[PDB]
Curated annotation (Swiss-Prot):
Sequence repeats lie at residues 37-98. This is Endo-1,4-beta-xylanase A. D-xylotriose 1 binds at residues 29, 38, 95, 122. The gene is xynA. It comes from Thermoclostridium stercorarium (Clostridium stercorarium). XynA is a modular enzyme. The number of CBM6 (carbohydrate binding type-6) domains varies between strains. The polymeric substrate can interact with several of these CBM6 domains. The chain holds residues 242 to 373 of 651 of the full protein.
Length: 132
């Protein structure tokens, strides 16, 4: 998977750098894209060297799920700074994707990003939004 990436261009969830998961699979999406699924509570997924430049204050992910769930967004490691939490309610099916966004604390420079899952969700991609 890429060693580094820009925070302000689409990051593919299936191009992760490490995970603790023993269940996670790369899955297909309805329009022949890919994502990650078979995710369980406590799973972490790490994306290396995301460059936030002069600042990001939002996060958007394209997700599908049939359960209410949340995803923590952490910097540097699973126990690094909690930037925010994305709360996702059911999108209607495991193949109905929705773009969902949340606020995060302003982060700058280059950091790894860890997504921490409280339950099953399928994730196609995500992107950050620049600070004002
Ligand atoms: Ca994808
Ligand atoms: Na394992």
């Amino acid at each position: 998977s890429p060693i580094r990436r820009d925070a302000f261009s689409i990051i593919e969830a299936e191009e992760y750098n490490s995970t603790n998961s023993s269940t996670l699979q790369v899955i297909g999406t309805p329009n022949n894209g890919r994502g990650i699924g078979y995710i369980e509570n406590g799973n972490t997924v790490t994306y290396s060297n995301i460059d936030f430049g002069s600042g990001a204050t939002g996060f958007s992910a394209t997700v599908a799920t049939e359960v209410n769930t949340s995803i923590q967004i952490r910097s540097d490691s699973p126990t690094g700074t909690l930037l925010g939490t994305l709360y996702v309610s059911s999108t209607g099916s495991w193949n109905t994707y929705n773009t969902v966004s949340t606020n995060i604390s302003k982060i700058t420079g280059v950091h790894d990003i860890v997504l921490v899952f409280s339950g099953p969700v399928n994730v196609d991609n995500f992107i950050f939004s620049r600070s004002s």
